[PDB]
From a paper:
The Interleukin 17 ([name]) family comprises several structurally-related dimeric cytokines that are elicited by infection and other immunological stimuli. The preeminent family member is IL17A3, which forms homodimers and can also heterodimerize with IL17F.
In addition to Cmpd 5, we also identified a salicylate fragment (Cmpd 7) as a binder to the C-terminal site in [name]. Interestingly, one copy of Cmpd 7 was observed to make a water-mediated interaction with His109 through its carboxylic acid moeity (in the analogous position as Cmpd 6’s pyridine). That same water molecule appeared to be further stabilized by Thr148 and the carboxylic acid moiety also utilized another water molecule to engage Asp107. The first was to merge aspects of the quinoline fragment with salicylate fragment by swapping the central pyridyl ring for a benzoic acid to productively engage His109, Thr148, and Asp107 (as seen in the salicylate fragment, Cmpd 7). From this observation and by comparison to another salicylate fragment (Cmpd 7) that we found also bound in this region, we were able to “link” the two copies into a larger molecule.
Residue numbers in the entry:
A (entry chain A): 44 to 48, 60 to 125, 132 to 153
B (entry chain B): 44 to 48, 65 to 154
Write the structure that this text describes.
């Protein structure tokens, strides 16, 4: 026991070859109550012609973050998606 | 005041993880991303500067010992962390 005293400001989500949207994650018993989580727009990645390359993969980049939960509060560690990256698939065993 | 109790090696914008350690902080250890290249990896496996690797930055909540060195009193603080990298067009679309 111890004592303790959203925005989208980057355009990377649209300029990325693995672009992403944001989804509202809301929990009234949590601080922050509203978290915006990334969801990749495509299964594949966008090529230089602007079309989807289904061979590559858009995958979410996750971060472990601290949140406060009403329980007087209790500290929790959760995983949130912050954006997406484009990867070459695992193609061997 | 309250009381409290490989995929990136495969990315076209790969990154390496770096230890951010602060004993005055909870969590003490945060693993941050540093993009490996300024370009992105092309289909030949080389760095290509027609596109750029950029680090996605996220504002995260953290506990800071207040007063310093205290084992049971903290202040809520927000810091900017690099979580991973994505591959972007070097151009922007707004004025
Ligand atoms: C990321 C992106 C988004 C929208 C596009 N819309 C039309 C055409 C290309 C687009 C690209 C894109 C992808 C890969 C690339 O290599 C390049 C590039 O080389 O500019 C551009
Ligand atoms: C991401 C990645 C990582 C390592 C590689 N090492 C050798 C060759 C290509 C590599 C690729 C890569 C990049 C873009 C791509 O478009 C493709 C692909 O289309 O296969 C593959």
């Amino acid at each position: 026991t111890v004592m303790v005293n959203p925005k989208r400001s980057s355009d990377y989500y649209n300029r990325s070859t693995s672009p992403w949207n944001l989804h509202r994650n809301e929990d009234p018993e949590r601080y922050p109550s509203v978290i915006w989580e990334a969801k990749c727009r495509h299964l594949g990645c966008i090529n230089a012609d602007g079309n989807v390359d289904y061979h590559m993969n858009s995958v979410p980049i996750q971060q472990e973050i601290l949140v406060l939960r009403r329980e007087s509060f209790r500290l929790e560690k959760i995983l949130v998606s912050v954006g997406c990256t484009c990867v070459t698939p695992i193609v061997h065993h």
